[PDB]
Amino acid sequence: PQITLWKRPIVTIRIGGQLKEALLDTGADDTVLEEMNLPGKWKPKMIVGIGGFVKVRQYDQIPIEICGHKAIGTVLVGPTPANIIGRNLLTQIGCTLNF
Amino acid sequence: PQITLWKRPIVTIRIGGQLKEALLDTGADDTVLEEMNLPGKWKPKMIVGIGGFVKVRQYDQIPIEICGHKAIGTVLVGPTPANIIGRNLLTQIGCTLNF
Ligand SMILES: CC(C)CN(C[C@@H](O)[C@H](Cc1ccccc1)NC(=O)O[C@H]1CO[C@H]2OCC[C@H]21)S(=O)(=O)c1ccc(N)cc1
Secondary structure (H helix, E strand, O other), rough: EEEEOOOOOEEEEEEEEEOOOEEEOOOOOOOOOOOOOOOOOEEEEOOOOOOOEEEOOOOEEEEEEEOOOOEEEEEEEEEOOOEOHHHHHHHHEEEEEEO | OEEOOOOEEEEEEEEOOOEEEEOOOOOOOOOEEEOOOOOOOEEEEEEOOOOEEEOOOOOOOOEEEOEEEEEEEEEEEEEOOOOOOOHHHHHHHHOOOOO
């Protein structure tokens, strides 16, 4: 699809058997989701945003479907005000900016 | 141009007679720049990011050139760890997501 930016680029994703909504966020290096349960090992990570540093849990090689496209990659989980799909997963579904 | 997302989508902008770099950020409603001087009236505004609420100054109808495209729009100024061009200005230069 071609998504214009008059509205937030929110799409439906499926992960760990749940349907959630998330932001396609080219300003994010990494995908970060609101608190949820994921299986397997995780390591503590820190990220920075507007507001400062935030502590998160990193899970790797997590299957996720994004607006109909299936992907596998790293997912961070923590106290984000928004589910965001960052560049690490946007590249997996062939997402680009165009103008 | 078509910009892939293996790297941060950083472009050169010109604003208040300065050249700066900024991130094309579909996950931002609003354009937010690191501390700088702009002419005219400004109102205090609050935004939220990953690390909480942040107080910023809002300036309206500011000319800005972004990767060669001229635009006019609202610019927020405050303690952001990055210059970010948000949807309010991405729409002005005809920027879309495609996958
Ligand atoms: C500031 C950027 C370098 C990075 N941010 C991504 C950014 O797109 C966030 C993404 C975002 C979105 C909503 C809430 C928090 C963070 N947007 C944001 O801070 O924008 C603010 C300015 O305009 C407003 O519109 C939306 C929030 C406001 S970030 O959320 O802090 C971030 C940092 C690292 C990762 N891996 C993921 C996300």
